[PDB]
Amino acid sequence: SATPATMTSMVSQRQDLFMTDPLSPGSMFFLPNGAKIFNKLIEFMKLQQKFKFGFNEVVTPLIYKKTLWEKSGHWENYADDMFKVETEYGLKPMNCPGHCLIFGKKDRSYNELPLRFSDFSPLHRNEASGALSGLTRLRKFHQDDGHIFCTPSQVKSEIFNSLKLIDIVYNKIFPFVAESNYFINFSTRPDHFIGDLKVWNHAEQVLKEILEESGKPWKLNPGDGAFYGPKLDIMVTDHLRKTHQVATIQLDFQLPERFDLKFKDQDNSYKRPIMIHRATFGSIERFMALLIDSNEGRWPFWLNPYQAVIIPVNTKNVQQLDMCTALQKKLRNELEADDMEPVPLNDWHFNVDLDIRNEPVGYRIKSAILKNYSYLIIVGDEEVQLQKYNIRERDNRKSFEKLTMSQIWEKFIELEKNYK
Amino acid sequence: SATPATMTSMVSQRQDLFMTDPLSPGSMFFLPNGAKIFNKLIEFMKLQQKFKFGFNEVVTPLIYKKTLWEKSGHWENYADDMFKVETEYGLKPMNCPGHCLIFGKKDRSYNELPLRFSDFSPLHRNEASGALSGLTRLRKFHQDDGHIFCTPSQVKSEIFNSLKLIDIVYNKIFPFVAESNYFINFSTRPDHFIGDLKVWNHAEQVLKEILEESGKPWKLNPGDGAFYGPKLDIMVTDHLRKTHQVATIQLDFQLPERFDLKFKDQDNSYKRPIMIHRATFGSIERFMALLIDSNEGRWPFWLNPYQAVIIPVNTKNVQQLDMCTALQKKLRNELEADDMEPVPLNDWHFNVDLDIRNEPVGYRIKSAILKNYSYLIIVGDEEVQLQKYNIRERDNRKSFEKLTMSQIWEKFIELEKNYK
Numbered sequence A, B: 001s002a003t004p005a006t007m008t009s010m011v012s013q014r015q016d017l018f019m020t021d022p023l024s025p026g027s028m029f030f031l032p033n034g035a036k037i038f039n040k041l042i043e044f045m046k047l048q049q050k051f052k053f054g055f056n057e058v059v060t061p062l063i064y065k066k067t068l069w070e071k072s073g074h075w076e077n078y079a080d081d082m083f084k085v086e087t088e089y090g091l092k093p094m095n096c097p098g099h100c101l102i103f104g105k106k107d108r109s110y111n112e113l114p115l116r117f118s119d120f121s122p123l124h125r126n127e128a129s130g131a132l133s134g135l136t137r138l139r140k141f142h143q144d145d146g147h148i149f150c151t152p153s154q155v156k157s158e159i160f161n162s163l164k165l166i167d168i169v170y171n172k173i174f175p176f177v178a179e180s181n182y183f184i185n186f187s188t189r190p191d192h193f194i195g196d197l198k199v200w201n202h203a204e205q206v207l208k209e210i211l212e213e214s215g216k217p218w219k220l221n222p223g224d225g226a227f228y229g230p231k232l233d234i235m236v237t238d239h240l241r242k243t244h245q246v247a248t249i250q251l252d253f254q255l256p257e258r259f260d261l262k263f264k265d266q267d268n269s270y271k272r273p274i275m276i277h278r279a280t281f282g283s284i285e286r287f288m289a290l291l292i293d294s295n296e297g298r299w300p301f302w303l304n305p306y307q308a309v310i311i312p313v314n315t316k317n318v319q320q321l322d323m324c325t326a327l328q329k330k331l332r333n334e335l336e337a338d339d340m341e342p343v344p345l346n347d348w349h350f351n352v353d354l355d356i357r358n359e360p361v362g363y364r365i366k367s368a369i370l371k372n373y374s375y376l377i378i379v380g381d382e383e384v385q386l387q388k389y390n391i392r393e394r395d396n397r398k399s400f401e402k403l404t405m406s407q408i409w410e411k412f413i414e415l416e417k418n419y420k
């Protein structure tokens, strides 16, 4: 009879992922295992954004004076959902205004467009306490945020590149449970919007054209556009057929005008850049919640905070213990605190545990299966003899391999490398 | 006639590192190049903390209700320097209370001590505007924070391990301008402190003993201890002989008591853990400021946002251009946005630029030297003939090497691997 929210709480209790406290309602605590997943997702997304999709990361303030939010139009649209800060300040619910400040700080040439900034800042929104639900709706969350500044003729290609990244995430790297794991909502001009209505109709026309050219299924979603522009909202469906907004792409002609943004064009004319807002995960928190809704805790290897467990058949057998300890040390790849040798960059480190509890071998196994370890590694007398480990995958326990220490090292590397 | 603050602003203007805006006084903006350095430092420290010094990273809320800060004793000690948050809330100036909440959420056995949590959360402190200076003193900053929960008999070894990490940073990996690049301030009981005076004298005795055993030079620093315990403050001296507090280690018997923290001991007795607070960089921002004070912008290779520049002698020569472009593509190691192949984990990517501006070769060189590129790579007709690049290091321009594409790839790898 379980809901998505309940599924998230069940997995979190089994794997020690997260916790909450009434001293900070709506703000999640990521415990070590929960934080490993969070950080892994961010590592993945940073790699795609920097070395494939042309983004440059920036780090921006969390609080801005009341004036910035008035200049942006946030203060009169959202201020009820905005935490005020007191010494006249607003705790940011969005990164965009900060990125406008960065754009307008230097002369900009058409030669550096499209200019793409990424930002993983924590955001706060004063969501009503009745709206709070697990990791899907929080008062504090992290967006894989990004703002693009381009020319009219670059809009289409930039949006298709955003859509390519979206497909890598939703239709290639991550399984979820249409052929596509999402549909698009075409979200149009809302009641309260800034800017002239002509510009708005043009932005909506550009977006519809791109939607049609993409060939992806979409739905009209009237009135749900941002206050600064219309958007494509990427909707995924949980197992209770309820839809959730994750990735989003927003076409913004309005903020550039309000920040008096300009760039020198090919003809030495000063012209306004167009701004595209975009997020792929949406928020890392909500994305994680939807992964869990699908995988029920059975993380893929590269993401799993429980990548492998090593289990000696006899916990008092020295030959088995040595062999198990040798492998754990190899796969964890840690250094001793006793010397001055630092951990080098780009080494591999795997989440590998050793269960030597004074418990029947059978129960230790069952324990590891409850935790969803990607791999179970057993060592008995025969394994000591061959100096080869019995290793089997979680979701295919019937088959198995007998591999050397070195072969497991390379196997785990290839898995993590390519997001298996 | 330059000050540290002025040096930071000069380097930042030359390398496009940071920016400020009056809409958010005391909060820094990290531009792409500035953010690269910031992120590199955090990557380095995470590796040491997770895979050498036994820390587990957590991610905690930024805002807590007034009650938490009252329970911790922060609200009556610091509340003037605390940004309040309004819907009864405090924007955190410290992570400790959150970590106490995490400790007390589960039954804890003596078997999991020392328990070590790390946290890179953004912190805010309402510093007086007259105290704001470059990156050394801000209203928003990131600590490489960490809290250790141990038993009385573990205190010494834990503090020596903290000191080992401090030496790796200040006396091995990073040059700065005593043999050691810091001295220690023994900071003692301040006017306003929580807890009984007997416990306080004991904490100070334990610390002095450890200080004496370490053999490191220290100075009495009366009254400057935290309100929860005495501390060892690691002081570095800028080139104007002014001292700055960076790393710190704080011995805390007090917070555990106020959060009713307990763990089951060897004898099934419930006992209070001791808490050690510690930071190595102090804040990433202030550490960066002190690096800049020393290096004057001449970053070591692994940290440099300008790792190499490739300069064709003749910008209209196709043979030279091809050879230059081949190398840039190799070293950057990017993927095209046009396919579904993701950037894999643990690949190498170098910050390598190509200067093909229509400018005399001589001036393009001079330009790169102004920016402090770690390596200058020149390609003329002879280099095309040999298919070998003329590569020279920044701080040793007189000598040079002629290397193939492959040899530069491996060279740059070895440099970044081992923090050269």
Ligand SMILES: C[C@@H](O)[C@H](N)C(=O)NS(=O)(=O)OC[C@H]1O[C@@H](n2cnc3c(N)ncnc32)[C@H](O)[C@@H]1O
Binding pocket: A093, A094, A095, A096, A125, A127, A135, A136, A137, A138, A139, A140, A141, A143, A145, A146, A245, A246, A247, A248, A250, A277, A278, A279, A281, A282, A283, A285, A286
């Ligand atoms: C995309 C940005 O550039 C733009 N300023 C923006 O904030 N768009 S948004 O309002 O639609 O937010 C983007 C994503 O953040 C996620 N999100 C929004 N609110 C919350 C919340 N209260 N809790 C968790 N995630 C949220 C959603 O997935 C949403 O699609």
Ligand SMILES: C[C@@H](O)[C@H](N)C(=O)NS(=O)(=O)OC[C@H]1O[C@@H](n2cnc3c(N)ncnc32)[C@H](O)[C@@H]1O
Binding pocket: B093, B094, B095, B096, B125, B127, B135, B136, B137, B138, B139, B140, B141, B143, B145, B146, B245, B246, B247, B248, B250, B277, B278, B279, B281, B282, B283, B285, B286
């Ligand atoms: C070390 C923590 O666990 C403890 N709660 C703590 O905050 N100690 S601290 O107050 O001494 O802060 C640690 C380091 O942060 C840095 N820091 C403190 N205030 C600022 C500031 N306003 N701007 C930049 N860095 C700061 C200093 O380097 C300082 O040594």
Ligand SMILES: [Zn+2]
Binding pocket: A094, A095, A096, A147, A277, A278
């Ligand atoms: Zn935005």
Ligand SMILES: [Zn+2]
Binding pocket: B094, B095, B096, B147, B277, B278
């Ligand atoms: Zn602390």
